[PDB]
Design a protein around this ligand. Structure first.
Ligand SMILES: Cc1cc2nc3c(=O)[nH]c(=O)nc-3n(C[C@H](O)[C@H](O)[C@H](O)COP(=O)(O)O)c2cc1C
Ligand SMILES: O=C(O)CCC(=O)C(=O)O
Ligand code: F3S
Length: 1475
């Protein structure tokens, strides 16, 4: 979406503002969507003051007295088109306007031209009419809106697509519709009418994830236009729904309050919901500025900027306990009529550029160059740093974040004033019965307790889903974590920890509305805090999670009674309910089992909610059954305010406090482990675990996580889910209450009536004889491998291992119900034809050895299929078909390879773009028949690439332009994709640089992917990849292998269906991958909707993976997943083998086609109706699963057109296209020429210069050009200005630019200069936006002005001088040189692992801001460092004329001192940080 305001202080309501808003909305177009029409908009809107002039002709024509300003008030109302319904409708507005003692003057029919609307909008269009109202008693301003508020709210009880109040106030009015932006003015005529005048305008342009517009949903709403995504919806909506009965405010009556009856409802959008919520705060006597602060608070903690402001730090300290953030990104813009303003989510996830004139004329908005002010008279050009607000007040004054936040610092204060004033070894079988397991303590608790980090591991979760498996499992194992993909971002929880927190308030929340004077550092509370708390504010009913045998018979009762016990205790004044399965001190054989703590914390949490009471107490879950990082998250997630994992905590104790261990600690394991460190380690490793899980969905605060329920349950039954975990999706739906009970009996069986010596081992993490199944195992793959080595019994073996398996995935419940007679293999399409649908699927040159990697690519190129360049670049030598192949099968070009033929090519068909952008280079981008945006991987959704240092050899270092020693933990998000629109920019950047190349976007299955996919389709992609939770990794956390992601049967299905219903299905080809290994897997994916098929792990196997499963270790015995030369030598493996393996898999498909009876996989895809539920299968745990989610897809028997895609989506006529047009193709093809060109840019001009880089690149690779094209520009640059810029390419920006300047930059120069006519101080004044220089690989960028957040995020080799910046300066930086001549946000070094950065920070405070975790703060001391800073502080002045630049130069001797230098230990010993 695009959002913005324009405000006018020192004029009176002109019509030009109104024109300006509309124009501006115009340049938001590329930020919004279109419906199936490609014509109707996902929405456009505008808030203004009542255009009291224009309405003057209404009263006039009717011969009526127009009421005062504050006493008119105007309902802008959408209404049914059918006349009789239109009247029914209108009689009601009036009924209820009447029913507050107000009076109707009548109604103005809103002049409109329906002819401009696209067909779908037009079919939808409500009939649109303004009701004009007044109050006889003499009500005005605040009381009248307050009353109207009550009225639009009552009218809101009957909300309909056909019946909806856009706005009803005496102060503000909304004109909106399902129109493309520049059409908004053509539809509504009022807006093009010079009697239309307003002191301001809030404008919004919508981008939806569907294709069926509903008019109410366009969006500047009643109070705000929101651009962003609440990523905690469900929680927030629950903690508001609970606030709802007990509202109290000043003379607000219990009858008026009750009238906003449900002010929040999960059926509406975060937006409607946010507006609503923020309304209730405003109409109840806070200004929208304050109400935003309560609801979308900055990250105050650690905030240098709050040194002089401790009042504000206390209002959050306060509000922090009361109201948890509405998280996710957000640029919020809102008006009261009294105030108009804007501010950001705590993270600054949306751009917000403002502009101010000598006459305090302001212009805020998503994009800089938008309303066009007369440059000469610009006073300030700024932006909102994270959490910053900026406003305007009718008393003619603008209002920057400081006053502002202080102004409600100041009042209702008690702030800080009141804040102040507020033995045997039964363990061995407790453990057993609670469900611990040999692998749980040995492979999980132990490592946390010993190293302080939950374990790393490798490969995919091979094993069946909790519900279909035959081995005991925890209830936790049914909940898969959800995570952010395109539609919002993850946050980096280690590099941006400073913004997170695990605080968790144990008091009861009161009135949000009534600020009266009248805490737990982490959720994990140790025995000490348990007592401490059990002293504390209130007394605290233990409620037996326990229950005796036979009498109270079943698990069902003890639930019924726990909740009743809970309900009852909370009424009786209990303000904390500690639910112990350890009540009064012990857990017997005949305490004959438990309530599972997840079940309990769910039940009491939803049943309290159901009781009006959830707000009264707050819950501690005191359980043995919690040890996992994921366990803790299930618990907080479904309600726990905190947790005391007493047995977990015990298991550290026994393990350390044991002879075996203490011994090895005397020599072997680390004896740096007094017990105080083992425990402080165990927890401290749980804390990093929670930070992680939240960051997977982009959530900063356990506080927010704590309502929400950021999970999808696979295999829980409908009743089970409502009773305990309400409103969680569970589409396959298995277990019942008794069913869970039976499982808890399975491992209670085994600690008690029997014996106890060591907890059982089922091979969950790793293949065992005794234990859980695994789609891949070392003996299984040894033989598959020997099969492909030849050209046989090994399939009898390999195929057999594949028969032996239980139920593992959802496809296993299905089977074929052919609708046509069996057919003949010779009619089926050839093996060569299928093979072209196969994809090796991208595993990183880091992670695999180049031997294994180049091999997949040569084999995949052979079959005429595709291979994928994981995430770690590609060696340029591969981009060349091979000449030199000799008799023996070898090539001097690739000596390490074997079995090569003369036409082979090791070049990846697909080039991956991932968060680190490691090899991401114009030629890279150009050697690629397709490009892949890696939103996420199966093994680890909300998380970045991971490559341990062990494995970062000089080769890799060189490839990634990063440092030899060092570990590569990529950023969770692309710093580049904070929203769907943002996605569309990267897709566009990439279609821009390689028009030829299809762009896929890779997403993991989870509920929500279908909506998201709809977005990716509208965002202009060519391919979407669904990856199951199944898939492999050469490294991930084990938690994530086993707990994040959902089956791809869910993914593919859901995307296929949504795509079809939204009529976007032709737009895109779908890849499915994750755990495919067999033709029947291909046929299952195909029926389910997939057109290509991806193979990682197996492809590896077929080259000679055993399943050592030591991938993240750099030990592959077998030469595949290592960088060790020794091991690499032992790589057996030739292209022929994988080539053959996919000939098998294809053959095997051809014959399924035969039993089924079609010629061509083209005939089966999404013929979901060919599937039926299997007759044999019975599982251990429930009677059955509901498979509606997989069987019920769009009939595809005749509608198969969607299966025809355009060869590649285009970016459109684009300015580069012309650039590339003039005498210009002579400066390229004549390898050396100067050319100059000059152009106006407007901010629709995006990625400019980029196509021409690709142009040169495609012919001279990155460094072969000696020409000198100088393109000079003027205006406001759109997104990605000067991306992927090459050598011999100079770009002048006369003006300003937006976000992503220099993205990808490889080579050459980008100079950006304010327009000369500015009377402002360049250095004090912003000129470039967020994430500039992202993954820069060469180049130098010179810019006269503050830049955005993330400056030079993943900068690998680019250089730059800018004059100031926001937060995260130099984020994951890794080489090159960055020079900043002005202030800079906090976190000023996060994970910057290589390269030099020089600041100049005169407030002296910089050291407080800097991220101290790896970078070190020096004073320039090396005289070769000065020689570095002066060259660039000079070069800047040469290219610009810089006013802070020139200053520093002829006062060189002075400024040089107090002014720091950033060194990574990595550069400690270079001729520029030493001597
Ligand atoms: C060794 C290894 C490295 C991988 N590297 C990447 C990576 O660089 N980027 C990515 O998106 N997926 C990566 N993956 C996942 C694959 O792209 C693919 O999604 C997955 O391996 C398919 O699941 P499967 O192993 O069950 O076939 C990797 C997987 C493994 C086995
Ligand atoms: O090679 C990398 O940069 C990381 C790839 C990854 O996370 C994986 O191997 O699963
Ligand atoms: S599991 Fe991995 S460590 Fe080796 S044998 Fe396979 S590549």
């Amino acid at each position: 979406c695009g959002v913005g305001f324009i405000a006018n202080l020192r004029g009176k309501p002109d019509h030009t503002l109104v024109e300006q808003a509309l124009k501006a909305l115009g340049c938001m177009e590329h930020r919004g969507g279109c419906s199936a029409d490609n014509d109707s908009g996902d929405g456009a809107g505008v808030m203004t003051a009542i255009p009291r002039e224009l309405l003057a002709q209404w009263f006039n024509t009717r011969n009526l007295p127009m009421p005062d300003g504050d006493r008119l008030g105007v309902g802008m109302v959408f209404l049914p088109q059918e006349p009789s319904a239109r009247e029914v409708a209108r009689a009601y507005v009036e009924e209820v306007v009447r029913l507050e003692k107000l009076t109707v003057l009548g109604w103005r029919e809103v002049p409109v031209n329906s002819d401009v609307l696209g067909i779908q909008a037009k079919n939808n269009q409500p009939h649109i009419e303004q009701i004009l109202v007044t109050c006889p008693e003499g009500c005005a301003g605040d009381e009248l809106d307050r009353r109207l508020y009550i009225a639009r709210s009552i009218i809101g009880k009957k909300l309909a697509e056909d019946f909806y109040v856009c706005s009803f106030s005496c102060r503000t009015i909304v004109y909106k519709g399902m129109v493309r932006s520049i059409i908004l003015g053509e539809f509504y005529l009022d807006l093009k009418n010079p009697g239309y005048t307003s002191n301001f305008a809030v404008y919004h342009r919508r981008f939806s994830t569907n294709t069926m517009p509903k008019w109410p949903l366009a969006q500047p709403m009643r109070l705000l236009g929101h651009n962003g995504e609440i990523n905690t919806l469900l929680g927030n909506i629950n903690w508001m729904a609970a606030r709802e009965k007990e509202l109290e405010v000043s003379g607000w009556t219990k009858a008026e309050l009750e009238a906003l009856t449900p002010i929040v409802n999960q059926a509406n959008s975060d937006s409607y919901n946010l507006d609503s919520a923020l309304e209730l705060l405003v109409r109840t006597g806070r200004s929208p500025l304050e109400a935003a602060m309560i609801l979308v608070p900055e990250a105050y903690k650690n905030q240098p900027a709050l040194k002089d402001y401790p009042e504000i730090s206390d209002f959050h300290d306060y509000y922090s306990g009361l109201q948890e953030p509405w998280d996710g990104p957000a640029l919020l813009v809102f008006s009261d009529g009294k105030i108009v303003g804007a501010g950001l989510d705590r993270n600054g996830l949306r751009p917000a550029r403002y502009c101010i004139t000598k006459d305090d004329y302001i212009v805020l908005g998503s994009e800089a160059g938008v309303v066009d002010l007369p440059e000469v008279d610009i006073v300030e050009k700024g932006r909102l740093a994270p959490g910053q607000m900026i406003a305007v007040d009718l008393a003619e004054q603008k209002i920057l974040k400081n006053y502002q936040i202080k102004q409600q610092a100041a009042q209702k204060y008690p702030y800080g004033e009141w804040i102040k004033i507020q033995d045997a070894q039964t363990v061995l079988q407790q453990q057993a019965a609670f469900g611990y397991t040999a692998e749980d303590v040995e492979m999980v608790v132990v490592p946390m307790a010993s190293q302080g980090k939950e374990p790393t591991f490798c490969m995919g979760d091979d094993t069946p889903l909790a519900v279909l498996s035959h081995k005991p499992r925890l209830l936790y194992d049914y909940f898969k974590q959800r995570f952010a993909q395109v539609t919002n971002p993850p946050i980096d929880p280690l590099r941006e920890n400073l913004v997170m927190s695990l605080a968790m308030f144990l008091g009861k929340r009161g009135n949000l509305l009534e600020p009266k004077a009248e805490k737990l550092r982490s959720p994990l509370v140790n025995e000490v805090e348990l007592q401490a708390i059990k002293t504390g504010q209130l007394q605290v009913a233990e409620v037996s999670t326990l229950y005796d045998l036979d009498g109270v018979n079943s698990l069902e009762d003890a639930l019924t009674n726990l909740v009743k016990t809970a309900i009852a205790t909370v009424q009786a004044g209990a303000e904390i309910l500690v639910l112990t399965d350890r009540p009064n001190g012990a857990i017997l054989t005949e305490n004959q089992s438990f309530i599972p703590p997840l079940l309990a914390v769910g039940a009491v949490h939803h049943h309290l909610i159901r009781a009006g009471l959830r707000l009264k107490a707050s819950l501690i879950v005191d359980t043995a059954q919690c040890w996992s990082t994921h366990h803790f998250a299930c618990l907080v997630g479904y309600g726990a305010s905190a947790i005391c994992p007493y047995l977990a905590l015990e298991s550290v104790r026994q393990w350390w406090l044991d002879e075996k261990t203490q011994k090895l600690m005397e020599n072997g394991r680390l004896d740096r482990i007094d017990l105080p460190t083992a425990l402080k380690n165990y927890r401290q490793s749980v804390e990093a675990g929670l930070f992680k899980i939240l960051s997977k969905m982009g959530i900063s605060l356990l506080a927010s996580y704590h309502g929400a329920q950021i999970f999808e349950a696979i295999g829980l039954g409908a009743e089970l889910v409502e009773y305990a975990f309400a409103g969680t999706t569970s589409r396959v739906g298995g277990l019942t209450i008794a069913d869970v009970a039976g499982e808890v009996m399975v491992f209670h069986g085994m600690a008690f009536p029997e014996m106890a010596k060591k907890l059982e081992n089922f091979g969950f993490v790793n293949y065992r004889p005794g234990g859980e199944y695994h789609m891949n195992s070392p003996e299984m793959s040894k033989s598959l491998h020997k099969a492909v080595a030849a050209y046989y019994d090994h399939y009898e073996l390999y195929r057999q291992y594949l028969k032996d398996r239980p139920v593992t995935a959802l496809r296993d419940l299905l089977d074929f119900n052919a609708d046509q007679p069996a057919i003949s293999l010779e009619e089926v399409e050839s093996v060569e034809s299928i093979v072209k649908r196969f994809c090796t699927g991208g595993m990183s040159l880091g992670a695999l050895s180049r031997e294994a990697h180049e091999t997949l690519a040569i084999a995949m190129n052979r079959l005429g299929a595709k291979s994928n360049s994981g995430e770690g670049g590609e060696d340029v030598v591969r981009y060349l078909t091979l000449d030199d192949v000799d008799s023996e099968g070898n090539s001097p070009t690739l000596p390490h390879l074997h079995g090569l033929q003369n036409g082979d090519t090791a070049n990846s068909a697909i080039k991956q773009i991932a968060s680190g952008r490691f090899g991401v280079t114009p030629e890279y981008l150009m050697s690629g028949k397709q490009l892949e945006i890696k939103m996420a991987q199966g093994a680890k959704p909300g998380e970045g690439g991971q490559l341990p240092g062990k494995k970062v050899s000089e080769y890799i270092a060189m490839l990634r332009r990063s440092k030899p020693g060092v570990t590569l933990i990529s950023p969770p998000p692309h710093h580049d994709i904070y929203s769907i629109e943002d996605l569309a920019q990267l897709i566009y950047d990439l279609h821009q640089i390689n028009p030829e190349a299809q762009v896929s976007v890779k997403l993991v299955a989870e509920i929500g992917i279908g909506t998201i996919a709809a977005g990716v389709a509208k965002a202009n992609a060519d391919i979407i990849q669904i990856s199951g939770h199944d898939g492999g990794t050469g490294a991930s956390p084990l938690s994530s292998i086993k707990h994040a992601g959902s089956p791809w049967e869910l993914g593919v299905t859901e995307v296929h269906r949504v795509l079809m219903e939204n009529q976007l299905r032709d737009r895109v080809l779908l890849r499915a991958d994750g755990g495919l290994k067999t033709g029947w897997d291909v046929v299952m994916a195909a029926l389910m909707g997939a057109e290509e098929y991806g193979f990682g792990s197996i492809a590896m196997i077929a080259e000679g993976c055993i399943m050592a499963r030591v991938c993240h270790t750099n030990n592959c015995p077998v030469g595949v997943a290592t960088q060790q030369e020794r091991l690499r030598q032992r790589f057996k493996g030739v292209p022929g083998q994988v080539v053959n393996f996919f000939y098998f898999i294809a053959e095997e498909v051809r014959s399924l086609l035969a039993h089924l009876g079609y010629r061509s996989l083209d005939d089966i895809i999404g013929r979901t109706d060919l599937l039926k539920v299997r007759s044999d299968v019975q599982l251990s745990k429930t009677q059955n699963l509901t498979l509606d989610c997989l069987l019920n897809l769009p009939d595809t028997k005749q509608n198969r057109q969607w299966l025809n895609h355009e060869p590649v989506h285009s970016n459109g006529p684009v300015l580069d296209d012309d650039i590339l047009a003039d005498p210009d193709i002579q400066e390229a093809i004549n390898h050396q020429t100067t050319a100059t060109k000059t152009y106006r840019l407007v901010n629709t001009d995006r990625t400019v210069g980029t196509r021409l880089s690709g142009a040169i690149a495609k012919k001279y690779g990155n460094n072969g050009f000696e020409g000198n094209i100088t393109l000079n520009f003027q205006g406001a640059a759109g997104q990605s200005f000067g991306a992927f810029n090459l050598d011999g390419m100079t770009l002048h920006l006369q003006g300003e630019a937006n976000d992503y300047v220099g993205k990808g930059m490889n080579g050459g120069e980008i100079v950006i200069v304010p327009h000369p006519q500015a009377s402002f101080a360049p250095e004090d004044n912003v000129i470039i936006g967020n994430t500039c220089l992202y993954g820069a690989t060469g180049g130098n960028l010179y810019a006269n002005g503050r830049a955005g957040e993330r400056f030079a995020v993943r900068n690998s080799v680019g250089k730059a001088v800018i004059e100031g910046a926001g937060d995260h300066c130099c984020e994951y930086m890794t080489g090159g040189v960055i020079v900043v001549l002005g202030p800079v946000g906090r976190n000023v070094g996060a994970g910057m692992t290589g390269g030099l950065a020089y600041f100049l920070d005169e407030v002296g405070d910089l050291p407080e801001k800097i991220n101290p975790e790896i970078i070190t703060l020096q004073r320039i001391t090396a005289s070769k460092g000065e020689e570095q800073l002066k060259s660039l502080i000079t070069a800047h002045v040469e290219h610009t004329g810089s006013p802070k630049g020139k200053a520093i130069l002829a006062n060189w001797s002075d400024y040089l001192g107090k002014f720091w230098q950033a060194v990574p230990p990595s550069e400690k010993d270079s001729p520029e940080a030493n001597n």
